[PDB]
Design a protein around this nucleic acid. Structure first.
Lengths: 64, 101
RNA sequence: GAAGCAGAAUUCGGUAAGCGUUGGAUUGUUCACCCACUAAUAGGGAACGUGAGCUGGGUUUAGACCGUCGUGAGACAGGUUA
RNA sequence: AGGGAAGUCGGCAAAAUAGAUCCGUAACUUCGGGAAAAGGAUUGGCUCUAAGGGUUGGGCACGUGCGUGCGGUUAACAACCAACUUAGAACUGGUACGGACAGGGGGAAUCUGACUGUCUAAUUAAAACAUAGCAUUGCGAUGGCCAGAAAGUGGUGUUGACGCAAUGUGAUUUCGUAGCCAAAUGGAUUAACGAGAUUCCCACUGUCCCUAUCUACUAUCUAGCGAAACCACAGCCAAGGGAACGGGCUUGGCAAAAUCAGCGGGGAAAGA
RNA sequence: GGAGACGACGGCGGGGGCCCCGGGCAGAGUUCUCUUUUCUUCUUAACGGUCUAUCACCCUGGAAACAGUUUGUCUGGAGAU
RNA sequence: GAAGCCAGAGGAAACUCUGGUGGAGGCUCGCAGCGGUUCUGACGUGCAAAUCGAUCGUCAAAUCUGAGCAUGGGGGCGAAA
């Protein structure tokens, strides 16, 4: 859910995943040479946090 | 200081030429062309803070006003005051002209 | 040489080793399967019927930890590190 | 050169970063840190400007250089003397401006030990040991733990439970698209620290495509000096030589003095 | 009773020596050009006399409107300035 | 850049914030010293029966080190290999 990501990364206002990773990289300082964002490393961090139980997500059970 | 000065003269480490800077200052269209030859999201400061004089992007307005005091910026200003070297000057050096009828 | 083998592309077979038979990804693994380029990416011997060119795994002196067994010294179904 | 890990078990090695001034710096955290995080701007010379100090010295009335009784805080003034920093500005050379030297590559994670520290002199520096912290047991002196052959023997003991001795463990923490209960939190998915082990990203490059060139010291040749290992005898192969082994035998091929630099197939060669 | 007689570390202050700058005498070097230049000597022991040197102590006096004061906040009616 | 201290702004006070001062730590970079991580390193009948080079760890202390003395093999000593 979107608000879970908002309280997870203290960030808001993205329209797509590329913008989300760019703002996350600029906020966390994940920058390459010239201040270019480290979108690959930030995506790796997001995927690792998703798997390691740091971002809240679950699959709802089917109703009877 | 110059970063990785050993490979400074390689073709992949080339910088923009001073006559190109002259044409960018004179006509905005060439400068716009040089802008779509780059990607805006990977530029320092998202391409908003750009010095045509030094042909360089910067992360912040305070960084731009910072470099304008520096002697690289003043050397670029001095070189543009003397004028860049062109093919017209190359022909005038040997006394060559172009006949177009 | 033969084939409903029109052509194009081939399939099966014969003489032939003259001449070639590549570049990579993958070690939570019998490293064997994938990808592309290519004319094509054929298979073997001279080691493996024991055995001093170089270097990774089987592989295991002395240090150390975990798992199983044993009262214990220790041994191992084993796993890791130098 | 161009490419940039295509090399390799594995980025081994090498390259790249590096001083200082300024801008700026995330998660996590035991709130101390992380942090020089990350990511950027600048650095020469010359001519100037500005700021930052020390020492000496006040007017009357008397007695006669001091004693008084006064009067004043524009000394906010003069004279003399002195050194190193900091900031600002113009001009100027440039392919370089910490110009040699000197001098962090950085980041995302996982495992692991709390950390600083210690050991296998001469193959292993480590998750080993120690450490502080925690828990248990014994002892109130005619006692506990020990030592000595014995002793009118000695230690702990110049000791007395906030102590001594032996153990085990080894910091701290733990032990409903988002609810309830507990003294902000519900944690070990534990911060910092590391010549510990592992994967990846950027940068970087002769690791590679695919090699080439230069320098010094050798190797080489000369003068002088001068060993050792090893050595049954010796040294070209092919086929056969039942005991899966030929260098000497058989049958062939062959086969020409004496040498020098190299090479690592074979014989020799591993305190084998 | 004192001395002998006593840890480690930090900044501050005094003194000696060394280093640095200026003038002068003498000597030496440089000198196409420049350089009143660059360098060298210019020292004072033990032992004594004399005059002074932080701390501290003594006398007068009695401090709030508190004061003195170190780079570092200590001191004073148990008497400060 | 820890306590402690000074000044200013608040706050009824207790406290909060800002600019300084100060110089703690089995802190940290790093010269010496001590040690010994890595190199298809050099060397391998060597300079050496353990040396050389680069690189590395630590560097105010559980640091390094001299001389004198004590512990002696059924032992000693051992942050235990």
């Amino acid at each position: 859910k979107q608000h879970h990501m908002e309280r997870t990364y203290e960030l808001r206002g993205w329209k797509d995943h590329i913008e989300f990773l760019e703002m996350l990289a600029r906020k966390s300082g994940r920058l390459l040479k010239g201040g270019e964002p480290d979108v690959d490393g930030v995506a790796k961090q997001v995927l690792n946090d998703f798997m390691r139980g740091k971002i809240p997500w679950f699959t709802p059970a089917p109703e009877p | 200081g110059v970063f990785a000065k050993r490979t400074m003269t390689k073709t992949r480490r080339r910088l923009r030429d001073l006559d190109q800077i002259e044409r960018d200052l004179r006509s905005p269209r060439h400068l716009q062309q040089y802008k779509e030859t780059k990607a805006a999201e990977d530029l320092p400061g998202l391409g908003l803070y750009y010095c045509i004089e030094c042909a360089k992007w910067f992360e912040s307005e305070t960084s731009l006003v910072g470099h304008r005091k520096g002697k690289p910026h003043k050397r670029r200003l001095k070189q543009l005051k003397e004028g860049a070297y062109t093919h017209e000057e190359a022909m005038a050096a040997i006394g060559y002209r172009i006949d177009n009828g």
